[PDB]
Design a protein around this ligand. Structure first.
Ligand code: HEM
Ligand SMILES: COc1ccc(C(=O)O)cc1
Ligand SMILES: [Cl-]
Length: 393
C-alpha cells in the first residue's frame, strides 16, 4: 500500500544533492512513509498542491515543523500566522497583507531599485566577488532592515536568528540541536526589536503596530507579527537571490537572453525560485482521518511536503531540471499555495526583480571563479559561498 523508505531528507548527504532522492520519493508512490522520522511524505506536485489547499484536514496550528505542538512545547511561542489555522489565522494574515501591500511596494520600489543598481556598480569595481556575502546577503541587508525600521545596532543577529528558525522546523538532529543551543542572544535581540518604540516610523514594523486598532489584531499581537517578518523576511530572499545568481552563472545562455530583454527579470527570479526552491520543505498535521493518493492517513500524523520536488516533478513540468527564464512559472509552490501562500512574496519578488534587472543592464558575464560552498539547513536550500567574476557590459 504505502511504501516505506529509509531516506533521511534532513541528512547532509541529502542536502548536498537532493535530486536523485527526490525522484526516488516521487517514483515510490503518491504517498510514502519515512521510517527515519515516522512521518508521511508527498513529493509529487499533485499531492503537495492538494495538501497545501486543504488546511482544514492538513492543519498548521500543530506546527509546520517535525514537532507536533500537541505533544511537545514549541521552541518559541507559536507564530500567529504561520502556525495558526483559520479563522484565527485570517485577520493577522489580512494585516500582514496590507502592511506588505501593492501600495507599500510602490513607495519602496524606487529605493529598492536604486540600491540594487548601486550594489551591482560597487561589485563591478571589484570584479571578483563572493555572490553570496557580497550580493545575495549584502543587497537584502541594504534594504530590508531599513524597510523594517530596525535600528542599525544589532543587525548582525538577523541572519543567525532566521537560520535558527528554519533549522528548528527540522527533526531533532545536530543542525537543530546546535541551532537552539546558540539561540539566546539572537532571540533576545529579535524579540526586543519587535516592541513598538524600537521600530522607525513608516517602516513595516511600525505599520504592523499601527494596525492594532481595527479589530483585526490587538496591540499584544503586534510584536509576534513583527517577529514573523524578522523570521521569514531576510534569509529567504538571500537564498532566492543567490539561487538566481547561481542559475545565471551556470546557464550563460539564459544570462544572455535576460541581457537582451531585462523585462524578463521578474520571471527569471520566479524561475529561480522554482528551480532551486529556497524553502524546500514544510510539514502539516492531519486533524482527522483522510484519503490522500489512495492512502488513508489517520488523525494526528505529520505530513512532510517536498516543495522543491514538487517544483521539479516531470508529471507537472516539461524539462523540470532546466532553468528557463521564459517558462510559464505560474503554479509553482516555492511560495506555497493556498491560504498560507507567502504573504511577503511581493517584497521577495521586488528584491529579486530589481537585482536581476540591474545585472541584466550592467553585467556581460558571470563566471564561477572559485570553489562553491553549500550551506546546510534543515529547511533552507542555498549556498554559503559563490565566488564569481563579474564582467561589465
Ligand atoms: C524567495 C523568498 C521567499 C520564499 C521562497 C518564501 C517561502 C514561503 C513559503 C513556502 C511559505 C508557505 C508556508 C506554509 O505554507 O506553511 C511562506 C509563508 C510566509 N512567508 Fe515567505 N518566502 C519568501 C520571502 C518572504 C518575505 C520577503 C517575507 C516578509 C517580508 C516572508 C514572510 C512570510 C510569512 C509571514 C509567511 C506566513 C504566511 C501565512 O502563514 O499565511 N516570506 N513563505
Ligand atoms: C516561510 O518561512 C516562515 C518562517 C517563519 C514565519 C513566522 O514566524 O511567522 C513564517 C514563514
Ligand atoms: Cl524566538
Amino acid at each position: 500500500t504505502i511504501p516505506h523508505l529509509a531516506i533521511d531528507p534532513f541528512s547532509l548527504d541529502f542536502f548536498d544533492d537532493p535530486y536523485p532522492d527526490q525522484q526516488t520519493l516521487r517514483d515510490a508512490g503518491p504517498v510514502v512513509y519515512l521510517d527515519k522520522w515516522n512521518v508521511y511524505g508527498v513529493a509529487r506536485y499533485a499531492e503537495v498542491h492538494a495538501v497545501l489547499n486543504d488546511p482544514t484536514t492538513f492543519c498548521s496550528s500543530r506546527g509546520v515543523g517535525l514537532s507536533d505542538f500537541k505533544k511537545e512545547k514549541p521552541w518559541r511561542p507559536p507564530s500567529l500566522i504561520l502556525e495558526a489555522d483559520p479563522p484565527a489565522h485570517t485577520r493577522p494574515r489580512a494585516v500582514l497583507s496590507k502592511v506588505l501591500s501593492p501600495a507599500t511596494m510602490k513607495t519602496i520600489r524606487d529605493g529598492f531599485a536604486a540600491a540594487a543598481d548601486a550594489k551591482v556598480d560597487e561589485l563591478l569595481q571589484r570584479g571578483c566577488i563572493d555572490a553570496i556575502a557580497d550580493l545575495a546577503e549584502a543587497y537584502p541587508l541594504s534594504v530590508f532592515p531599513d524597510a523594517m525600521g530596525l535600528k542599525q545596532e544589532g543587525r548582525e543577529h538577523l541572519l543567525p536568528y532566521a537560520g535558527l528558525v528554519f533549522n528548528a522546523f527540522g527533526p531533532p538532529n545536530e543542525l537543530r540541536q546546535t541551532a537552539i543551543e546558540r539561540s539566546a542572544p539572537h532571540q533576545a535581540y529579535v524579540n526586543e526589536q519587535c516592541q513598538r518604540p524600537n521600530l522607525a516610523p513608516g517602516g513595516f514594523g511600525a505599520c504592523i503596530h499601527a494596525f492594532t486598532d481595527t479589530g483585526e489584531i490587538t496591540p499584544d499581537e503586534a510584536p509576534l507579527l513583527v517577529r514573523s517578518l524578522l523570521s521569514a523576511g531576510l534569509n529567504t530572499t538571500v537564498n532566492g537571490i543567490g539561487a538566481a545568481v547561481y542559475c545565471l552563472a551556470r546557464f550563460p545562455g539564459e544570462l544572455q537572453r535576460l541581457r537582451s530583454d531585462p523585462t524578463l527579470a521578474r520571471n527569471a527570479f520566479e524561475e529561480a525560485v522554482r528551480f532551486e526552491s529556497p524553502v524546500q520543505t514544510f510539514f502539516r498535521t492531519t486533524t482527522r482521518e483522510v484519503e490522500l493518493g489512495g492512502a488513508v492517513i489517520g488523525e494526528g500524523e505529520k505530513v512532510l511536503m517536498f516543495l522543491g520536488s514538487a517544483n521539479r516533478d516531470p508529471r507537472r513540468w516539461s524539462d523540470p531540471d532546466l532553468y528557463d527564464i521564459t517558462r510559464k512559472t505560474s503554479g509553482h509552490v516555492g511560495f506555497g499555495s493556498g491560504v498560507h501562500m507567502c504573504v511577503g512574496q511581493l517584497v521577495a519578488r521586488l528584491e529579486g526583480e530589481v537585482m536581476l534587472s540591474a545585472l541584466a543592464r550592467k553585467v556581460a558575464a558571470i563566471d564561477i571563479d572559485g570553489p562553491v560552498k553549500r550551506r546546510f539547513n534543515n529547511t533552507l536550500r542555498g549556498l554559503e559561498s559563490l565566488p564569481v567574476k563579474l564582467t561589465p557590459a
